[PDB]
Amino acid sequence: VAQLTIGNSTITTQEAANIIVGYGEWPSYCSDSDATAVDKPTRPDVSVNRFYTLDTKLWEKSSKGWYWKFPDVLTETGVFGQNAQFHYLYRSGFCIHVQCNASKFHQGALLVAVLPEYVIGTVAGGTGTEDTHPPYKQTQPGADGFELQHPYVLDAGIPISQLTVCPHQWINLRTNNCATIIVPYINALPFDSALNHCNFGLLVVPISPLDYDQGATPVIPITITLAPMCSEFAGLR
């Protein structure tokens, strides 16, 4: 156990469980001989790259699961959201740290994964004859994230049983309370629109449901802390 600091942000955490480096690649920068070498892309350091701890979610027996979209999740939040909006192009990596706080008498297991291009789908009017399209509140939910309505198919017609094919980590209350994942910038272009395109989604779903006996705190806190890594912005507005 030891507490780390980046700028003015300080989180208390355990020495070092096993971190997961998405696709074995560390988030890196983009070198000079690139498409936009005229408009030098400023690489924020100071405050922009630090610990952002979002509103804790409460895990319940009934909870189906939550997901957040990146970079959307921070585009509203502080000085990162500052750059995310008034800059034409963006690229960046992320350190994601999902932590729980529960007693040795609580039980359950969360699957924490990162899915690039997490396109959401709708129920299509139930009968599937309605070509309905997900709302903006569902597509880009902000820092509060959004709750899954049909986890089994990840609200998108795909088996969550296979979600482990993506960078992921398990949070099994009887053995660990935190998961850490490093995501490199993943896209078909070197730079892209921070507000229009969400490069990936953060999924945290209960596979083994929360449980405890009557009298124990009934809601367990899932706290997402995340820090940008090697972020770059271009074209100020």
Partner: protein, 218 residues
């Protein structure tokens, strides 16, 4: 001991039937002796789910045109297969000047000659095609649309100023080649509803596979 059959190239090889153009004499269907087929790799049923095992892909395609009458008969008819690349105007009539625009590669061939065959390069302005795009192109109806995936269009037609003496059919086969893919994802487990999105029938959400009576009885 070998593993060649499980390589991406192996998995995506073979020429499948992706399109079928009908050029009837009398009819409601394609009444102008011509047809415009926008290239859709999804034409082969089975393809959608397979390519969607990945997020980003890159490849070339070999197109083969097998033409005949609806009875499989071979007739003395000259045809024109024109490839109008993305960004180019497609023909709107049997007499459109598009059919004559040099920058739209055309192959002229006889129904008697063996199938025509050509190669189409990776067209995207992006580094790779991508089956999923979580965003909007600069609630909405534009969600998930990656336009930079247009491969082009094939405009088919019998040659000549006068309608063809014969009823025809052109089948388009496509073979993917030089395949590369990134970011694997869970395999579709609910039936598809629309070509453009992952929408699933929320009433009929079925379990990924078969079920049984009890977990203790095989």
């Amino acid at each position: 001991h070998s593993t060649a059959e499980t390589t991406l190239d192996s998995f995506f090889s073979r020429a499948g039937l992706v399109g079928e153009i009908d050029l009837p004499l009398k009819g409601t269907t394609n009444p102008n002796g011509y047809a415009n087929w926008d290239i859709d790799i999804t034409g082969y049923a089975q393809m959608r789910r397979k390519v969607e095992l990945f997020t980003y892909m890159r490849f070339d395609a070999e197109f083969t045109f097998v033409a005949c009458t609806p009875t499989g008969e071979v007739v003395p008819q000259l045809l024109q297969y024109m490839f109008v690349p993305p960004g180019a105007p497609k023909p709107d009539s049997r007499e459109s000047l598009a059919w004559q625009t040099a920058t739209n590669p055309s192959v002229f061939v006889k129904l008697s000659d063996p199938p025509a065959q050509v190669s189409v390069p990776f067209m995207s302005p992006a580094s790779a095609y991508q089956w999923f795009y979580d965003g909007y192109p600069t609630k909405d109806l534009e969600y998930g649309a990656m336009p930079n995936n247009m491969m082009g269009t094939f405009s088919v037609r019998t040659v000549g100023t006068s309608k063809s003496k014969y009823p025809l059919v052109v089948r388009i086969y496509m073979r993917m080649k030089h395949v590369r893919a990134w970011i694997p994802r869970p395999m579709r487990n609910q039936n598809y509803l629309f070509k453009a999105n992952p929408n699933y029938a929320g009433n009929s959400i079925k379990p990924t596979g078969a079920s049984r009576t009890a977990i203790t009885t095989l």
